[PDB]
């Protein structure tokens, strides 16, 4: 199923059928939200932050416990990313690859693995331009 690769991996997360908060959960929704903003204020992402709340606070799902997705909580409190998370790490990923090529010009596979990356960025950047999350004039590098 992977593009740019032949892998057929299916490993993922399995959202439970029940969409209500767990019965054992006995923490106020507001006390969750103040935890969300503090971690984001520290600089942590919606992806990592969910791991922290799920790992150490019993928050199975921010939407289930609080009723809203975490981006909306962060946006409601004024915390938003410059660019969508998926694209930002793709950009940093390409930067790390590019910085690698100047020092080592004979890394010809890394030259290929580079090509696979911005092609992913162009497809992701194109989609984000259509939905208007990303301003139209935006171009990669």
């Amino acid at each position: 199923g992977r593009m740019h690769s032949a892998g057929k991996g299916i490993s993922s997360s399995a959202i439970p059928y029940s969409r209500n908060a767990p019965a054992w959960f006995k923490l106020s929704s507001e006390s969750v939200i103040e935890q969300i903003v503090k971690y984001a204020r520290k600089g942590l992402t919606p992806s990592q932050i969910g791991v922290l709340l799920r790992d150490a606070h019993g928050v199975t799902q921010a939407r289930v416990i609080t009723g809203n997705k975490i981006m909306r909580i962060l946006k409601s409190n004024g915390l938003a990313p410059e660019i969508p998370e998926d694209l930002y790490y793709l950009i940093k990923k390409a930067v790390s690859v590019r910085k690698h090529l100047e020092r080592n010009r004979k890394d010809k596979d890394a030259k290929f693995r580079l090509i696979l990356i911005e092609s992913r960025i162009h497809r992701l950047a194109r989609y984000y331009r259509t939905v208007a999350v990303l301003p139209p004039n935006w171009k990669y590098e």
Partner: peptide, 22 residues
């Protein structure tokens, strides 16, 4: 948590960087 924290992810972060840049 400290290593996984990003200096430039949110709107306010780059604006802080923009403030220090000039």
């Amino acid at each position: 948590i400290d290593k996984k924290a990003k200096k430039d992810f949110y709107r306010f972060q780059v604006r802080e960087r923009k403030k220090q840049e000039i």
